[PDB]
Design a protein around this ligand. Structure first.
Ligand SMILES: CCCCCCCCCCCCCCCCCC(=O)OC[C@H](COP(=O)([O-])OCC(O)COP(=O)([O-])OC[C@@H](COC(=O)CCCCCCCCCCCCCCCCC)OC(=O)CCCCCCCCCCCCCCCCC)OC(=O)CCCCCCCCCCCCCCCCC
Ligand SMILES: CCCCCCCCCCCCCCCCCC(=O)OC[C@H](COP(=O)([O-])OCC(O)COP(=O)([O-])OC[C@@H](COC(=O)CCCCCCCCCCCCCCCCC)OC(=O)CCCCCCCCCCCCCCCCC)OC(=O)CCCCCCCCCCCCCCCCC
Ligand SMILES: CCCCCCCCCCCCCCCCCC(=O)OC[C@H](COP(=O)([O-])OCC(O)COP(=O)([O-])OC[C@@H](COC(=O)CCCCCCCCCCCCCCCCC)OC(=O)CCCCCCCCCCCCCCCCC)OC(=O)CCCCCCCCCCCCCCCCC
Ligand SMILES: CCCCCCCCCCCCCCCCCC(=O)OC[C@H](COP(=O)(O)OCCN)OC(=O)CCCCCCCCCCCCCCCCC
Ligand SMILES: CCCCCCCCCCCCCCCCCC(=O)OC[C@H](COP(=O)(O)OCCN)OC(=O)CCCCCCCCCCCCCCCCC
Ligand SMILES: CCCCCCCCCCCCCCCCCC(=O)OC[C@H](COP(=O)(O)OCCN)OC(=O)CCCCCCCCCCCCCCCCC
Ligand SMILES: CCCCCCCCCCCCCC(=O)SCCNC(=O)CCNC(=O)[C@@H](O)C(C)(C)COP(=O)(O)O
Lengths: 169, 111, 157, 276, 77, 126, 88, 106, 13, 65, 118, 178
């Protein structure tokens, strides 16, 4: 159900078995027994379940919201468009929270996959995590419990004013 | 990849099974210490299987079996980092606890 | 129930008749009874029982409160909940308290001093540093591949 | 970490030298071996610490199970001063207890040889605190001495238990777990250590006095505690000294701390908080 | 029921209790509980347990199995 | 070579000198204490072994102890300079102490953020 | 299995066994109702030694006041039976 | 001293009543009134292995393969060890061998 | 045999 | 399993306990002897720790004077 | 060791400390010093998944031992031969470290001799 | 345990208690039986040497000095029997010593599980009913008019009568209830 575009995974590179010893492998014996006893009835039950699903197949859709006017083009005191912009901002905040969760899972998956080479081969994942956490700290940090579109806009305006003042010299 | 995770969570299921038997109101008809001792020895055997697998291929495992809650930008998930330490201590602790519960069945008599 | 005000604790006794009444209320003898000093801490006529825990009580006796090692009707110490057998012990020790304090403090101070002595005088083996390759494993520890590190050079000996 | 581990293994071995309750003796043995692991983690040797975790788990499981069989056969009697002739009256438990004591002290090619000896070589060969090294070696010698104290005062000398013989260790539920733990305490360290993937490269080019240090100090501790036990067998009372008083009275830490800290805490609570 | 052994079998001679009794008789003293303590030094308990005799328990059969294993290995190669 | 008693290690009832030089008034004091103890024990034993009893046994000593520890304190409290100073220090000194600790820490952290010397590398869940 | 229960006859036999093993008590004049001073001719130190001998055999402590109350082997046996709940 | 006659008589009567009470603590033989073995390898252990292990193994294997592998990063494992002279099963390329090993003194 | 009664609280409720 | 208690004599030892105890101790001693014969690296190692003083200046590469 | 007594009792000027080793240029006393060579390289160490502590100058012997263990996982008492080969390589590395220590100590003594000559 | 302590310990009782405590700490120090027998005979010889004292103030001073020596030379861990206070098995079975009045609260089905034992239980209860008033009358009669009284209790003084306050002593839980 998941896609490698959003959950990237390098292709596995397993080595071929080269048994120098003449002893039988209990892992291979127990694995073959494990498939023949467990995997076949489980996949039979799941195939019966899946054909019942195909007999009664239903569909659901992912909801999409159009872009309401943002709070910058929105008059103060006129609580209608205040409310619309604020709930759009809250929706985008939740979306950014889940984006952060996605990036954190990517970083954890990289570290577990590389193992002892995580300090070198996870440079791209760590760089992506660092860039996205710098952006998140620029947009949402230190807002408080009553975080809102107005508070985010005030913080962004303060940051832009500081950057403009620092850009004069 | 499937047999490894199945074995680890089967160790956990075989550990939790005598608790459900204890709260399931059939202890008065069965031999609960002997049943639990057999449960621990079987948990030790299914713990011995990934010990052999890790001793062969040195595969390091992470299993995220259940997502508990997602909390803004922090996901609390019930996960197991199946380590060398985790595998070997699982096998050693299950073997030791099998010995201790057999000794407990002997020692806590007339209790 | 039948607990009335004359059997409940009262104010600090002044007259010897008040002291005798308090002693009869607390089931104590008059000269055994001794209230806390009138320092205005809310003690009043409650007796100053000696600061002995329940561990010093005779354990071979069938006390009415067997866990508390107290009989029924005898006065209860103000700090009984501190002096219960699950809590602070005031029992006599085979060696004295100051001797224990000085011995433990001297052992701890001696250990700290000798640890500092061993730290300023470390013990090792007559060897050099461990030799590590490839600019001391620069790419392995995670150095930036775009910039070139300083060449770490090792030689045979 | 290294200093704390060395201090706690030294202190717990000192406490273990003069206890009379066998469970307390092997408990302070457990704490001293934990101090050895803590020293090993003070070094950059975590895998050696985990190997010692498994090794120690095997040993203390079997030793404690043997001690419990001794207590049950002697009718809930726990201190070593009322034991004796255990080698003759309980041969299976005696043999397993001897296996546990020797392998805990570090008899070669047992389960404890593959962790404890490597720990001793690591601390002897890498840059550590000198006092921590010295008290770690002395703690190992004390491990030998209290294992000798257990062996002597339980498995040797004349009987001291009450006369009525109620020993019956013929139960399979008693024998079989000790058999499994004996097979563990003999072969499991060898099998595990030969199955470990190679990590934490040990050093083997090292002088002979440093190499045989653990075995030499274990033999020295066994001999010293044997002659001390024979001196206790000798017919003469001696006046006690503050060193043995410190060792027998738990180092005064439980008495002093468990009397001064709860008293100050509860006194502050009642006298200040609630009342005032 | 349970039958006790004859108390008259508990004798003082040939014991560390005999050594203690002679040491007390040097100082003009008599020990009356020595016959009560005499059962721990007689019969199956009458024996000196030695520390190499404790450590080297089963060493004979262990060495026998060791030399049989060496002979089997030598005959194998 | 003498044992030194402590509040947490008291003098033994056999090492104290008070029971070696005994007195007739101390003897009769012990006699009367045993008399009161025996009277209370007899009353409690009668009430305990009474079969017609259908409830527990109330303890007036426990009731008196609870009343003294709970309800008698404010009627029997009088303000003195010692307890006034003790109440003032125990109700304020920790508060000003932790106020200064937290104020210094928060001012230092705030200043470090204002000139940016404090680094929050991955701190997003504050 | 283990810890066989006690009997009045067994307790009496063990107490008389220890008293016969005691050197100051001749076994021909020893009876279950023999008093320690009236017809055995002992003293308080001897009585304390007898109580400690019973204590060491039976593996439990008689308290000091009850121990001073016990004065003949019949009272000792009755105390042992009362303490260990032996009724036959 | 010894027993006073009053406490001696009291203990004798109390102990006799204790004997009666402890005798009455006994159980009659009808109390309490309550209202295919084969060999251990073939029935004691085999039934346990096929009942309390096999069905749980089935359920865990179903949950693992059809509710964890269907999700992206639940079961994540490290890369296996790849040595010179080995053949990759998934890719099909052989790893080139090592150098000539100049030191062969031991 | 010789088994004795065991005094237990009311576990029925 | 149940045995007759003894009052003051040596208990009657069963065959199984003494046989199995001496078997366990003999197995331990056989294991120790076998491993000591096969790999005696408990003593001295097998690398023969060098003496740094016997090393020479020309292989240590110090300039002469 | 006697080196610790020499450093802490007699003098610390000639007896060295472990951190600034070497304290002398590597060409001093060696007219031409060979670069230390390794068999194993970075790609095969990454493939063999060696930890950063064990990626030293015996990585080739370690790779061979790990390959032997992975192949003959049954009968794990199989290749004590190249277990001993890796151990001997580590012994040679430790001997080289001892040689570095002795060289820098003798160079310290030579420097003190030069100072007293001047 | 079965006898109540007096108002005070006499000098003879204190001497016996010191002798017993000294010999117990001597066995704790000596461990071995022959060594303990030797040194306990020495201690008994010391007590017999100081036995015949008539002044009794010198005897009190000797007792004080002897117990001072005992406190100087006492074992840090003296041997304690497991059932003794401070032992290992002390109060181990108080969690199993269920008082007998819960059988009054038992269900009729649980009562029917043990019919004969419960029938004997109401026989004992009826005996207690019949004896309580008589033993209260005996306690009221035998109380001395003086304020002197000890914790000792009278026995039954005639046939068909029970000792006063016998219920909590006779019907106490067993030290091995299970
Ligand atoms: C990941 C893991 C996360 C969790 C980690 C937790 C770690 C810390 C654990 C601390 C445990 C502390 C402890 O000792 O607790 C004892 C405590 C019971 O103490 P006890 O001494 O046995 O009490 C019995 C009486 O003394 C005497 O009674 P008895 O001897 O006759 O016993 C009969 C037995 C009989 O047991 C019962 O009758 C079971 C009662 C519940 C039945 C539910 C049926 C639902 C059917 C749905 C269809 O009764 C009991 O065992 C206790 C009864 C009450 C238990 C209540 C437990 C929660 C029930 C929640 C139900 C939710 C329903 C939702 C719909 O144990 C529990 O409460 C359960 C076991 C521990 C938790 C579960 C196992 C670990 C987590 C697995 C996931
Ligand atoms: C040869 C035979 C081979 C047989 C193979 C297996 C065949 C089989 O049974 O297939 C499953 C078969 C079809 O499988 P499927 O359609 O592929 O599964 C889709 C899911 O069912 C789709 O999910 P669903 O929502 O439709 O049904 C599942 C739902 C069912 O839920 C309910 O029904 C609601 C509850 C009802 C209670 C009634 C009383 O469960 C949940 O939502 C979650 C349950 C979680 C239970 C455990 C909670 C652990 C809490 C731990 C706390 C501590 C965390 C610490 C974390 C630390 C780190 C941060 O039937 C089911 O799935 C029904 C399961 C019924 C479970 C009942 C007991 C639990 C309730
Ligand atoms: C200038 C020339 C005179 C200088 C002079 O006399 O200096 C001594 C004079 C104190 O007089 P004293 O030597 O204590 O007199 C004792 C009597 O002779 C003998 O005492 P007495 O028993 O005859 O008097 C009965 C009782 C008479 O009864 C009382 O005094 C009742 C208690 C009065 C308030 C106590 C506050 C402290 C305790 C707080 C506890 C914790 C509360 C929760 C947190 O007096 C006392 O307990 C003695 C202490 C009197 C303190 C009076 C303080 C008045 C100013 C309070 C300012 C606000 C305080 C904080 C309020 C916070 C509200 C949220 O002033 C100072 O020591 C300077 C500091 C004064 C307070 C600021
Ligand atoms: C070289 C470097 C060396 C460095 C060394 C550093 C040492 C640090 C030591 C830190 C811990 C010290 C305090 C420990 C207190 C333990 C108190 C305790 O549990 O005492 C037990 C005691 C009774 O037990 P006991 O006397 O042992 O046995 C009686 C058996 N018949 O009493 C009881 O059971 C009383 C019951 C509890 C009463 C309430 C206690 C409340 C305590 C609140 C403490 C709050 C502050 C904690 C600060 C911790 C700091 C680490
Ligand atoms: C805002 C409220 C401020 C309230 C300040 C109250 C100051 C009271 C000063 C004072 O009088 O302290 C007395 C106190 C104890 O002295 P005293 O009253 O004689 O107590 C009897 C036994 N100590 O003295 C002390 O406790 C000593 C204080 C030393 C500093
Ligand atoms: C107690 C142990 C609880 C372990 C955690 C829960 C396991 C069951 C589970 O995950 O059930 C939920 C799952 C469907 O979840 P999903 O489709 O992802 O959507 C969730 C939205 N309702 O539902 C399913 O997958 C339905 C099919 C379940 C088949 C039976 C599985 C039994 C074995 C589970 C072993 C888990 C062991 C974990 C041990 C942890 C430590 C105790
Ligand atoms: C471990 C260290 C232990 C140290 C203990 C040292 C004790 C040795 C010194 C002594 O025994 S001093 C004893 C002083 N006691 C007396 O003088 C008591 C003498 N008074 C008497 O009435 C005595 O005759 C008796 C023995 C009490 C009378 O008893 P009868 O047999 O009832």
């Amino acid at each position: 159900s998941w896609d490698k575009d959003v959950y990237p995974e390098p292709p596995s590179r397993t080595p071929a078995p080269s048994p120098q010893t003449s002893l039988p492998n209990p892992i291979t014996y127990l694995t073959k027994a494990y498939d023949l006893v467990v995997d076949w009835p489980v996949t039979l039950v799941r195939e019966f379940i899946e054909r019942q699903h195909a007999k009664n197949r239903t569909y659901y859709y992912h909801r999409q919201y159009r872009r309401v006017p943002d709070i910058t083009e929105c008059k103060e005191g006129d609580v209608l468009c205040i409310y619309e912009a604020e709930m759009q901002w809250r929706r985008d905040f939740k979306v950014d929270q889940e984006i952060m969760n996605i990036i954190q899972e990517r970083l954890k998956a990289c570290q577990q996959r590389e193992g002892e080479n995580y300090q070198q081969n996870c440079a791209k994942e760590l760089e992506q995590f660092t860039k996205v956490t710098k952006a998140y700290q620029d947009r949402y940090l230190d807002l408080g419990a009553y975080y809102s579109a107005r508070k985010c806009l005030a913080k962004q305006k303060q940051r832009m004013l500081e950057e403009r003042k620092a850009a004069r010299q | 990849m499937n047999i490894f995770t199945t074995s680890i969570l089967l160790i956990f299921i075989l550990l939790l099974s005598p608790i459900l038997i204890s709260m399931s109101n059939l202890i008065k008809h069965i031999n609960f210490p002997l049943y639990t001792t057999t449960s621990i020895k079987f948990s030790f055997i299914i713990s011995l299987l990934p010990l052999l697998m890790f001793f062969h291929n040195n595969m390091e495992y992470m299993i995220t079996t259940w997502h508990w809650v997602t909390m803004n930008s922090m996901e609390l998930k019930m996960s197991f980092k199946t380590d060398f330490f985790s595998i070997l201590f699982t096998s050693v602790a299950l073997f030791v606890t099998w010995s201790i519960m057999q000794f407990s069945s002997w020692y806590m008599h007339s209790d | 129930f039948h607990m009335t005000k004359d059997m409940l604790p009262g104010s600090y006794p002044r007259t010897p008749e008040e002291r005798a009444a308090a002693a009869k209320k607390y089931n104590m003898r008059v000269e055994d009874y001794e209230p806390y000093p009138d320092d205005g801490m809310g003690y009043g006529d409650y007796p100053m029982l000696p600061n002995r825990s329940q561990h010093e009580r005779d354990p071979w006796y069938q006390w009415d409160h067997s866990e508390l090692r107290m009989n029924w009707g005898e006065p209860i110490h103000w700090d009984l909940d501190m002096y219960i057998r699950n809590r602070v012990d005031t029992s006599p020790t085979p060696v004295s308290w100051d001797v224990m304090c000085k011995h433990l403090f001297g052992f701890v101070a001696f250990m700290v001093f000798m640890f500092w002595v061993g730290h300023v005088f470390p013990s090792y083996q007559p060897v050099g540093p461990k030799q590590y390759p490839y600019n001391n494993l620069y790419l392995e520890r995670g150095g930036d591949p775009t910039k070139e590190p300083e060449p770490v050079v090792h030689y045979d000996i | 970490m290294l200093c704390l581990g060395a201090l706690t293994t030294l202190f717990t071995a000192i406490c273990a030298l003069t206890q009379n309750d066998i469970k307390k003796i092997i408990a302070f043995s457990t704490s001293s071996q934990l101090g050895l692991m803590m020293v090993t983690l003070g070094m950059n040797q975590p895998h050696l610490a985990f190997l010692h975790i498994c090794t120690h788990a095997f040993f203390k499981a079997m030793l404690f199970m043997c001690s419990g069989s001794i207590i049950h056969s002697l009718a809930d009697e726990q201190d070593i001063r009322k034991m004796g002739n255990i080698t003759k009256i309980m041969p299976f438990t005696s043999s397993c207890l001897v296996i546990g004591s020797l392998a805990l002290t570090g008899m070669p090619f047992l389960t404890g040889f593959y962790s404890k000896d490597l720990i001793i070589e690591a601390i002897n060969t890498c840059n550590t605190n000198a006092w921590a090294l010295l008290i770690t070696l002395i703690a190992t010698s004390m491990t030998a001495m209290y294992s000798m104290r257990i062996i002597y005062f339980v498995t040797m000398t004349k009987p001291r238990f009450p006369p009525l013989i109620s020993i019956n260790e013929n139960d399979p539920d008693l024998m079989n777990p000790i058999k499994r733990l004996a097979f563990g305490s003999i072969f499991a360290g060898f099998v595990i250590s030969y199955n470990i993937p190679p990590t934490s490269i040990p050093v083997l080019t090292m002088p002979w006095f440093l190499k045989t240090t653990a075995l030499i100090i274990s033999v020295l501790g066994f001999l010293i505690a044997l002659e001390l036990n024979n001196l206790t067998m000798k017919l003469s009372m001696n006046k006690a000294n503050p060193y043995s008083s410190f060792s027998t009275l738990l180092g005064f830490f439980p008495s002093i701390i468990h009397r001064i800290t709860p008293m100050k805490s509860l006194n502050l609570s009642l006298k200040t908080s609630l009342t005032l | 029921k349970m039958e006790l052994p004859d108390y008259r079998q508990w004798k003082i001679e040939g014991t560390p209790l005999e050594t203690v009794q002679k040491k007390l008789a040097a100082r003009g003293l008599r020990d009356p509980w020595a016959r009560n303590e005499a059962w721990r030094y007689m019969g199956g308990f009458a024996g000196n347990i030695t520390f190499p005799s404790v450590i080297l328990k089963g060493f004979k059969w262990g060495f026998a199995a060791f030399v049989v294993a060496l002979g089997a290995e030598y005959f194998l190669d | 070579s003498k044992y030194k008693p402590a509040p947490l290690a008291t003098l033994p009832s056999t090492l104290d000198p008070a029971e070696y030089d005994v007195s007739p008034e101390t003897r009769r004091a012990q006699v009367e204490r045993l008399s009161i103890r025996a009277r209370l024990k007899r009353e409690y034993l009668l009430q305990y072994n009474d079969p017609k009893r259908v409830s527990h046994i109330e303890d007036p000593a426990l009731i008196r102890w609870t009343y003294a520890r709970s309800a008698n304190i404010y009627p029997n409290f009088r303000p003195t300079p010692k307890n006034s100073l003790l109440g003032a220090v125990a109700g304020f000194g920790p508060l000003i102490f932790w106020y200064y600790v937290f104020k210094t820490d928060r001012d230092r952290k705030e200043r470090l953020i204002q000139e940016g010397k404090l680094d929050r590398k991955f701190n997003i869940s504050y | 299995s283990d810890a066989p229960p006690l009997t009045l006859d067994g307790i009496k036999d063990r107490v008389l066994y220890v008293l016969k093993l005691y050197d100051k008590i001749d076994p021909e004049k020893l009876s279950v109702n023999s008093h320690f001073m009236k017809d055995l001719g002992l003293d308080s130190l001897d009585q304390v030694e007898i109580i400690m001998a019973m204590e060491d055999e039976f593996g439990f402590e008689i308290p000091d006041i009850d121990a001073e109350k016990l004065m003949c082997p019949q009272e000792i046996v009755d105390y042992i039976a009362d303490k260990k709940d032996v009724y036959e | 001293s010894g027993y006073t006659p009053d406490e001696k008589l009291r203990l004798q009567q109390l102990r006799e009543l204790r004997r009666r009470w402890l005798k009455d603590q006994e159980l009659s033989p009808r109390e309490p009134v309550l209202p295919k073995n084969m060999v251990f390898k073939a029935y004691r252990s085999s039934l346990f292995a096929v009942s309390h292990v096999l069905i749980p193994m089935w359920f865990v294997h179903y949950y693992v393969k059809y509710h964890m592998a269907t999700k992206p990063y639940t079961i994540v494992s490290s890369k296996p060890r790849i040595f010179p002279g080995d053949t990759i099963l998934e890719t099909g390329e052989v790893i080139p061998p090592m150098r000539d090993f100049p030191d062969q003194h031991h | 045999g010789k088994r004795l009664f065991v005094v237990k609280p009311s576990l029925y409720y | 399993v149940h045995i007759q208690p003894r009052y003051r004599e040596f208990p009657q030892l069963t065959r199984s306990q003494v046989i199995q105890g001496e078997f366990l101790s003999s197995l331990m001693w056989f294991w120790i002897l076998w491993r000591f014969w096969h790999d005696s690296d408990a003593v001295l190692g097998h690398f023969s720790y060098p003496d740094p003083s016997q090393w020479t200046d020309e292989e240590l590469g110090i300039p002469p004077d | 060791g006697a080196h610790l007594t020499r450093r802490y009792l007699w003098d610390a000027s000639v007896e060295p400390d472990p951190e600034k080793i070497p304290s002398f240029p590597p060409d001093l006393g060696f007219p031409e010093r060979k670069e230390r060579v390794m068999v194993a390289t970075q790609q095969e160490m990454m493939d063999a998944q060696l930890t950063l502590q064990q990626r030293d100058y015996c990585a080739h012997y370690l790779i061979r031992l790990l390959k032997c263990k992975r192949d003959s996982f049954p009968n794990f008492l199989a290749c004590k031969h190249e277990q001993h080969d890796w151990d001997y390589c580590e012994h040679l590395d430790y001997v080289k470290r001892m040689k570095e220590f002795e060289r820098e100590r003798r160079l310290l003594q030579r420097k003190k001799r030069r100072a007293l000559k001047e | 345990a079965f006898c109540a302590p007096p108002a005070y310990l006499t000098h003879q009782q204190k001497v016996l208690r010191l002798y017993k405590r000294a010999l117990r700490h001597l066995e704790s120090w000596c461990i071995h039986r022959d060594k303990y027998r030797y040194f306990a005979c020495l201690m008994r010889a010391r007590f017999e040497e100081h036995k015949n004292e008539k002044d009794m103030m010198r005897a009190t001073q000797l007792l004080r000095e002897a117990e001072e020596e005992f406190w100087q030379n006492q074992h840090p861990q003296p041997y304690i029997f497991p059932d003794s206070p401070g032992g290992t098995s002390f109060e181990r079975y108080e969690c199993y010593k269920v008082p007998e009045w819960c059988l009054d609260y038992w269900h009729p089905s649980e009562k029917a599980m043990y019919p004969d034992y419960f029938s004997k239980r109401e026989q004992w209860k009826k005996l207690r009913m019949e004896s309580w008033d008589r033993e209260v009358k005996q306690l009221q009669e035998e109380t001395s008019p003086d304020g002197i009284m000890t914790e000792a209790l009278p026995p039954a003084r005639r046939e068909g009568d029970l000792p006063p306050l016998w219920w909590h002593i006779v019907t106490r839980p067993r030290e091995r209830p299970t």
